[PDB]
Enzyme design. Sequence first.
Site, short mmCIF file in Angstrom:
data_model
loop_
_atom_site.label_atom_id
_atom_site.label_comp_id
_atom_site.label_asym_id
_atom_site.label_seq_id
_atom_site.Cartn_x
_atom_site.Cartn_y
_atom_site.Cartn_z
N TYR A 158 1.02 -1.35 -0.08
CA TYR A 158 -0.17 0.23 -0.29
C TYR A 158 0.95 1.18 -0.34
O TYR A 158 2.04 1.22 0.38
CB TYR A 158 -1.15 -0.26 1.18
N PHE A 197 2.04 9.83 3.14
CA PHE A 197 2.53 9.79 4.42
C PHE A 197 2.80 8.07 5.09
O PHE A 197 3.79 8.14 6.01
CB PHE A 197 1.42 9.72 5.25
N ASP A 198 2.74 7.58 3.76
CA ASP A 198 3.45 6.13 4.51
C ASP A 198 3.42 5.32 2.86
O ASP A 198 2.21 5.15 2.13
CB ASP A 198 2.63 5.54 5.66
N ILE A 204 -8.17 -0.03 9.82
CA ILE A 204 -9.27 1.14 10.20
C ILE A 204 -10.51 0.38 9.26
O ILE A 204 -10.74 -0.76 8.48
CB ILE A 204 -8.85 2.83 9.41
N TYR A 241 -9.52 8.25 11.01
CA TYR A 241 -8.97 8.37 11.67
C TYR A 241 -10.08 9.31 12.33
O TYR A 241 -9.75 9.89 13.82
CB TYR A 241 -7.48 8.91 11.60
N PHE A 250 -5.42 5.23 -0.03
CA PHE A 250 -4.98 4.16 -0.56
C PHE A 250 -5.04 3.90 -1.56
O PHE A 250 -6.03 3.02 -2.20
CB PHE A 250 -5.24 3.28 1.02
C1 LIG Z 1 1.47 -1.62 17.57
C2 LIG Z 1 1.96 -0.62 16.24
C3 LIG Z 1 1.39 -1.20 15.03
C4 LIG Z 1 0.66 -0.91 14.56
O1 LIG Z 1 0.10 0.39 14.21
C5 LIG Z 1 -1.38 -1.15 15.00
C6 LIG Z 1 -2.65 -0.79 14.08
O2 LIG Z 1 -3.31 -1.17 14.08
C7 LIG Z 1 -2.42 -0.39 12.69
C8 LIG Z 1 -1.73 -1.74 11.58
C9 LIG Z 1 -3.68 0.50 12.36
C10 LIG Z 1 -3.55 1.81 13.17
C11 LIG Z 1 -2.83 2.92 13.63
C12 LIG Z 1 -4.52 1.34 13.70
C13 LIG Z 1 -5.69 2.84 14.69
C14 LIG Z 1 -5.28 1.94 15.89
C15 LIG Z 1 -5.85 3.55 16.94
C16 LIG Z 1 -7.67 3.27 16.45
O3 LIG Z 1 -7.45 4.89 17.45
C17 LIG Z 1 -7.37 3.69 15.12
O4 LIG Z 1 -8.80 4.16 14.77
C18 LIG Z 1 -9.51 5.27 13.77
C19 LIG Z 1 -7.12 3.40 14.55
O5 LIG Z 1 -2.97 0.78 11.36
C20 LIG Z 1 -4.35 0.52 9.74
O6 LIG Z 1 -5.31 0.83 10.04
C21 LIG Z 1 -4.09 1.72 8.63
C22 LIG Z 1 -4.24 1.17 7.11
C23 LIG Z 1 -3.47 -0.36 7.12
C24 LIG Z 1 -2.06 0.04 6.68
C25 LIG Z 1 -1.32 0.83 8.11
N1 LIG Z 1 -2.99 2.07 8.40
C26 LIG Z 1 -2.36 3.44 7.54
O7 LIG Z 1 -3.43 3.91 8.08
C27 LIG Z 1 -0.95 3.84 8.01
O8 LIG Z 1 -0.60 3.98 6.32
C28 LIG Z 1 -0.18 3.89 8.65
O9 LIG Z 1 0.41 5.28 8.79
O10 LIG Z 1 0.69 2.74 9.41
C29 LIG Z 1 1.54 2.93 10.10
C30 LIG Z 1 2.32 1.78 9.93
O11 LIG Z 1 3.09 1.77 10.61
C31 LIG Z 1 4.33 2.29 9.14
C32 LIG Z 1 1.25 0.46 11.15
C33 LIG Z 1 1.41 -1.26 11.02
C34 LIG Z 1 2.48 -1.25 9.01
C35 LIG Z 1 3.08 -0.67 11.31
C36 LIG Z 1 2.82 -1.72 12.72
C37 LIG Z 1 1.73 -3.36 12.60
O12 LIG Z 1 3.51 -1.68 13.66
C38 LIG Z 1 2.41 -0.76 13.68
C39 LIG Z 1 0.88 3.94 11.39
O13 LIG Z 1 2.04 3.70 12.45
C40 LIG Z 1 1.75 4.18 13.63
C41 LIG Z 1 -0.10 5.14 11.36
C42 LIG Z 1 -0.69 5.09 10.11
C43 LIG Z 1 -1.49 6.11 10.04
#
Ligand SMILES: CC[C@H]1C(=O)C[C@H](O)[C@@H](C)[C@@H](/C(C)=C/[C@@H]2CC[C@@H](O)[C@H](OC)C2)OC(=O)[C@@H]2CCCCN2C(=O)C(=O)[C@]2(O)O[C@H]([C@@H](OC)C[C@@H](C)C[C@@]3(C)O[C@H]13)[C@@H](OC)C[C@H]2C
Length: 107
Positions: free
Chosen positions: A26, A36-37, A56, A82, A99
């Site tokens: 992605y 941003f990522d 999400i 978010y 995305f």
């Molecule tokens: C514990 C650390 C663990 C983690 O963040 C797990 C977590 O569940 C991830 C999977 C989830 C996310 C952040 C949920 C929130 C939980 C809080 C709740 O209030 C919110 O509701 C609104 C939702 O991400 C998502 O749903 C979405 C959709 C899938 C892709 C990621 N996502 C993005 O939006 C991104 O592109 C973003 O840049 O991805 C990076 C990334 O790290 C480089 C995450 C993983 C690749 C790395 C991992 C597993 O290592 C972390 C992330 O970093 C912190 C910030 C976000 C902006």
Amino acid sequence: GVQVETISPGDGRTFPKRGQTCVVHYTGMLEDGKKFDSSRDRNKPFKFMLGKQEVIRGWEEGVAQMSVGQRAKLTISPDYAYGATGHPGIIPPHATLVFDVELLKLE
Ligand SMILES: CC[C@H]1C(=O)C[C@H](O)[C@@H](C)[C@@H](/C(C)=C/[C@@H]2CC[C@@H](O)[C@H](OC)C2)OC(=O)[C@@H]2CCCCN2C(=O)C(=O)[C@]2(O)O[C@H]([C@@H](OC)C[C@@H](C)C[C@@]3(C)O[C@H]13)[C@@H](OC)C[C@H]2C
């Protein structure tokens, strides 16, 4: 909600099911396309299990509508991303996100 617009078609047959691990690449962008990522930047496909509240809402709903091999542009309203909170320093409050997602395989 989430809008799903195909960039390149998948097989049109094999869609994620609850309990399967979706393996994707992605790129995440703000509404205006600013990146941003990206999992591509780190050479590391992202894995998540459907039905486990790992992502999400816009991803849970959008990726489920993709078939294996598809690339799609997911435009996700703040309510499906978010929300009011955003994620300080990365995601503004009340942000629509875009995305580019490629569904590589199901494991
Ligand atoms: C514990 C650390 C663990 C983690 O963040 C797990 C977590 O569940 C991830 C999977 C989830 C996310 C952040 C949920 C929130 C939980 C809080 C709740 O209030 C919110 O509701 C609104 C939702 O991400 C998502 O749903 C979405 C959709 C899938 C892709 C990621 N996502 C993005 O939006 C991104 O592109 C973003 O840049 O991805 C990076 C990334 O790290 C480089 C995450 C993983 C690749 C790395 C991992 C597993 O290592 C972390 C992330 O970093 C912190 C910030 C976000 C902006």
